[PDB]
Write a protein that binds this ligand. Structure first.
Ligand SMILES: *[C@@H]1O[C@H](CO)[C@@H](O[C@@H]2O[C@H](CO)[C@@H](O[C@@H]3O[C@H](CO[C@H]4O[C@H](CO)[C@@H](O)[C@H](O)[C@@H]4O)[C@@H](O)[C@H](O[C@H]4O[C@H](CO)[C@@H](O)[C@H](O)[C@@H]4O)[C@@H]3O)[C@H](O)[C@H]2NC(C)=O)[C@H](O)[C@H]1NC(C)=O
Ligand SMILES: *[C@@H]1O[C@H](CO)[C@@H](O[C@@H]2O[C@H](CO)[C@@H](O)[C@H](O)[C@H]2NC(C)=O)[C@H](O)[C@H]1NC(C)=O
Ligand SMILES: *[C@@H]1O[C@H](CO)[C@@H](O[C@@H]2O[C@H](CO)[C@@H](O)[C@H](O)[C@H]2NC(C)=O)[C@H](O)[C@H]1NC(C)=O
Ligand SMILES: *[C@@H]1O[C@H](CO)[C@@H](O[C@@H]2O[C@H](CO)[C@@H](O)[C@H](O)[C@H]2NC(C)=O)[C@H](O)[C@H]1NC(C)=O
Ligand SMILES: *[C@@H]1O[C@H](CO)[C@@H](O)[C@H](O)[C@H]1NC(C)=O
Ligand SMILES: *[C@@H]1O[C@H](CO)[C@@H](O)[C@H](O)[C@H]1NC(C)=O
Ligand SMILES: *[C@@H]1O[C@H](CO)[C@@H](O)[C@H](O)[C@H]1NC(C)=O
Ligand SMILES: *[C@@H]1O[C@H](CO)[C@@H](O)[C@H](O)[C@H]1NC(C)=O
Ligand SMILES: *[C@@H]1O[C@H](CO)[C@@H](O)[C@H](O)[C@H]1NC(C)=O
Ligand SMILES: *[C@@H]1O[C@H](CO)[C@@H](O)[C@H](O)[C@H]1NC(C)=O
Ligand SMILES: *[C@@H]1O[C@H](CO)[C@@H](O)[C@H](O)[C@H]1NC(C)=O
Ligand SMILES: *[C@@H]1O[C@H](CO)[C@@H](O)[C@H](O)[C@H]1NC(C)=O
Ligand SMILES: *[C@@H]1O[C@H](CO)[C@@H](O)[C@H](O)[C@H]1NC(C)=O
Ligand SMILES: *[C@@H]1O[C@H](CO)[C@@H](O)[C@H](O)[C@H]1NC(C)=O
Lengths: 460, 123, 52
């Protein structure tokens, strides 16, 4: 006859909500006695069988720019990073004035000797010690033309908390798992432009392998694409929104260094010892990064022919960074526990006008691109609340046989009748890397209650 | 089928799978956050169970209530609802009317229970 | 200048960003927050009350 309402429990309907998430790590990350920095004592392990079920005919809108897991991941990384430097050595008795000269006979033109006095394990006795501090960690306090007085940089503003020499900065993968009563929708569309509907949504509980790499201006190890180069942006109208280029073919990049002596152990009290840079044996060279020439050339050509779809009659150009200090204009990362800040002058020096150039030469692979750069030791990252460190050095030489995944670009402001616009690389906020690694997923809440029309009559 | 096996399937065929989406509602730095989330999940399930039990539909998945359905709410034929539509569009176009439906179910349960105690007391 | 009763000048010295160098500063502390530590009839040595 007429419609009578009936209640249903166990109904698959969805809403958008913001809740905290869990961890998930591999089984090999718990047998290590170095305790890592994230996945040994806090994060829970996962099962070795990630079940994924594809849904039939559902279309769901995705917005990777207005996301909750990016902000939660950033807050969790910041909090877990600040909690891992509390039981470590603090370099408060190192703000004494340093007397610094050239590095012996035949100076290296990059380090200063910087001999000082320090308090030993006895509170009365003091001893004269020496090191080799890097030049960007040395500030010339002066009142006249004095070339022998120097001090450390982090004693001026806030703290000198050294990292512990047991943990490591190795980026092992982690997975984010939704809590009970929540699911994660993942879009499998290959032509996903970042915002809009998706028609191959699959429901998963735990995310795939995410490596929280510390990098700016250029993306390190990460997940590749499937079909072609993908452009990620939210408006593509103004010049103040960072655009992400997601690649398809990796390009090999290595970074090397000359030798050092050892970790010179200097005591500043009971138990608190720090490892400074000792001597340098052998000849001194530069710390450089090598990138293949023809792979970078046809990769940038592929980026050009794919980016020409959004600009039909305009040529693209590249040049240097748009000014600033050391920390923002250089591609910065870390390897083996030592940080690198490297100039990108020889990578973004070119232009594309729409005419493709084919590179067919087998013997031309010998030519490479070299990036010469220096090393810092005190890191002021996260653009605030960073808990200013002092990275301990490594004894021998190191290698950085790495992989490249994406690029971060920013358009410059043009003038009238400017048909040739430029794209300069820039980093800035840390959220861009984890936003590039979390475009697929979206947290979702299920409501098991519902109503439906039928002809059910409850008996009395 | 596990999570959301019939989230876009046939309306008549989505009534055979409510058990698997209802079986799994409970299954220092991070000693408080997961605790708060777990207690929140427990109270979400308990609120759902109490809301089911407040109109006499506890322990039964598909329960029936004698309150009628007004023509100003859906005005659509039953056959193509149960054979063509899905749950998500139904939640899209019914969720603005849910509170008065819940109130009607509560009033109908109150009337049914008051007739039940009147019949028990008069006998 | 003036009398400025119930207040005292109480200029001290404190460390700068360098642990070696120290610089002189001044303030105006209230009278009940100042205790005259004394071993003789010295009318210039004073200290802060809560450091005791
Ligand atoms: C992007 O991806 C690349 C490749 O996946 C990563 O490169 C790896 O980086 C890690 C560290 O960042 C490297 O691990 C280190 O290797 C050093 C040399 O390894 C050789 O020698 C050892 C024996 O000494 C062999 O077992 C090994 O197979 C190699 O032949 C080691 O000396 C290092 O040891 C240090 O760490 C351990 C544990 O923390 C300490 O106990 C030690 O005392 C010492 O301090 C370390 O194991 C790894 O080798 C790199 N891979 C390759 C192929 O070279 C990038 O790091 C990654 N990220 C970025 C940003 O590029
Ligand atoms: C930095 O200066 C110190 C002191 O001026 C140097 O230490 C001396 O090194 C010579 C070797 O040339 C030794 O004979 C002395 O005994 C050292 N004096 C000490 C330890 O008090 C130190 O070599 C200098 N650093 C560099 C890199 O040359
Ligand atoms: C102590 O830190 C302050 C910043 O809080 C320094 O002020 C500026 O520092 C930058 C970075 O080196 C310089 O480029 C500027 O020239 C500094 N001055 C101004 C007015 O911006 C300050 O110089 C530091 N102290 C010392 C002695 O160097
Ligand atoms: C340090 O504090 C103690 C309290 O624990 C002071 O002891 C008394 O302080 C009052 C307040 O001036 C005096 O009236 C008493 O005479 C003090 N002694 C006793 C036994 O009660 C002590 O005086 C403080 N130190 C100094 C130098 O004033
Ligand atoms: C999804 O809906 C379309 C619309 O009729 C239907 O043809 C298709 O079979 C549905 N998919 C599944 C898996 O039932
Ligand atoms: C450091 O302490 C020593 C004590 O042996 C002293 O001789 C020296 O003058 C002090 N200052 C410097 C700058 O070395
Ligand atoms: C959706 O993604 C799955 C992932 O394996 C794939 O098998 C399937 O073909 C995709 N759907 C379409 C229509 O391509
Ligand atoms: C950003 O996008 C909105 C709509 O997508 C548009 O109205 C607005 O003009 C864009 N911003 C700029 C600076 O053009
Ligand atoms: C890049 O920026 C510099 C800054 O002065 C400018 O001179 C140059 O024309 C720009 N373009 C190229 C292709 O170098
Ligand atoms: C990078 O290299 C260019 C040319 O080699 C040079 O002009 C510039 O000063 C270097 N440094 C930075 C931070 O751009
Ligand atoms: C860029 O490339 C041109 C062409 O090879 C070269 O002449 C120039 O030195 C390079 N570097 C800069 C900073 O322009
Ligand atoms: C640098 O270290 C690697 C191992 O980490 C080693 O194979 C290589 O020979 C070293 N470089 C030099 C110049 O010895
Ligand atoms: C990067 O590329 C090299 C060779 O192309 C490969 O061996 C390596 O596994 C790649 N890195 C990752 C993280 O897959
Ligand atoms: C305070 O410290 C300074 C250090 O510059 C010293 O010269 C002075 O004698 C000390 N005492 C007083 C009472 O100022």
């Amino acid at each position: 006859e007429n419609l009578w309402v009936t209640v249903y429990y166990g109904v698959p309907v969805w809403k958008e909500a913001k809740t905290t998430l869990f961890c998930a790590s591999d089984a090999r990350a718990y047998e290590k006695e170095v305790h890592n920095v994230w996945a040994t004592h806090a994060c829970v392990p996962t099962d070795p069988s990630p079940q994924e079920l594809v849904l039939g005919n559902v279309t769901e809108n995705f917005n990777m720019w207005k996301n909750d897991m990016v902000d939660q991941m950033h807050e969790d990384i910041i909090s877990l990073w600040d909690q891992s430097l509390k039981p470590c050595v603090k370099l408060t008795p190192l703000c004494v004035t340093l007397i610094c000269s050239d590095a012996g006979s035949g100076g290296v033109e990059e380090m200063k000797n910087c001999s000082f006095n320090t308090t030993t394990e006895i509170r009365d006795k003091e001893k004269k010690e020496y090191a080799l501090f890097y030049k960007p960690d040395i500030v010339p306090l002066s009142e006249t033309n004095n070339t022998s007085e120097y001090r450390l940089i982090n004693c001026n503003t806030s703290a000198c908390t050294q990292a512990c020499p047991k943990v490591t900065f190795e980026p092992i993968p982690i997975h984010y798992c939704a809590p009970a009563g929540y699911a994660i929708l993942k879009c499998n569309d290959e032509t996903f432009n970042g915002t809009g509907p998706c028609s191959n949504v699959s429901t998963v509980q735990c995310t795939h392998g995410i490596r929280p790499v510390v990098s700016t201006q250029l993306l390190l190890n990460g997940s590749l694409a499937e079909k072609e180069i993908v452009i990620r942006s939210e408006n593509l109208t103004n010049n103040a929104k960072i655009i992400i280029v997601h690649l398809h073919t990796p390009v090999e990049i290595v970074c090397t260094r000359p030798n050092n002596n050892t970790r010179k152990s200097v005591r500043i009290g009971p138990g608190q010892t720090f490892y400074a840079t000792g001597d340098i044996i052998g000849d001194i060279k530069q710390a450089h990064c090598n990138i293949s020439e023809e792979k970078w050339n046809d990769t940038l050509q592929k980026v050009g022919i794919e980016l020409q779809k959004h600009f039909p009659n305009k040529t693209i150009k590249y040049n240097q960074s748009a000014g600033g200090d050391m920390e923002i204009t250089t591609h910065s990362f870390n390897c083996g526990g030592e940080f690198f800040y490297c100039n990108t002058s020889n990578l973004f020096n070119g232009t594309y006008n729409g005419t493709y150039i084919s590179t067919n030469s087998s013997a031309n692979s010998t030519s490479t691109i070299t990036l010469q750069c220096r090393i810092k030791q005190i890191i002021n990252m996260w653009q605030g609340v960073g808990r200013c460190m002092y990275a301990p050095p490594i004894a021998g030489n190191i290698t950085c046989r790495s992989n490249i995944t994406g690029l971060l670009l920013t358009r410059d402001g043009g003038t009238n009748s400017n048909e040739t616009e430029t794209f300069r690389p820039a980093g800035g906020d840390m959220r861009d890397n984890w936003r590039s690694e979390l475009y697929k997923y979206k947290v979702v809440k299920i409501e098991p209650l519902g109503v439906a029309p039928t002809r059910c009559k409850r008996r009395v | 089928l596990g999570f959301l096996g019939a989230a876009g399937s046939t309306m008549g065929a989505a009534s055979m799978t409510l058990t698997v989406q209802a079986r799994n509602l409970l299954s220092t730095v991070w000693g408080i956050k997961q605790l708060q989330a777990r207690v929140l999940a427990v109270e979400r399930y308990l609120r759902d169970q109490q809301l089911l039990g407040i109109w006499g539909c506890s322990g039964k998945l598909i329960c029936c209530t004698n309150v009628p359905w007004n023509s100003s709410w859906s005005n659509r034929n039953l056959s193509e609802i149960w054979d063509n539509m899905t749950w998500l569009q139904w939640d899209k176009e019914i969720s603005n009317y849910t509170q008065i439906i819940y109130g009607l179910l509560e009033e109908s349960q109150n009337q049914q229970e008051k007739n039940e105690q009147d019949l028990l007391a008069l006998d």
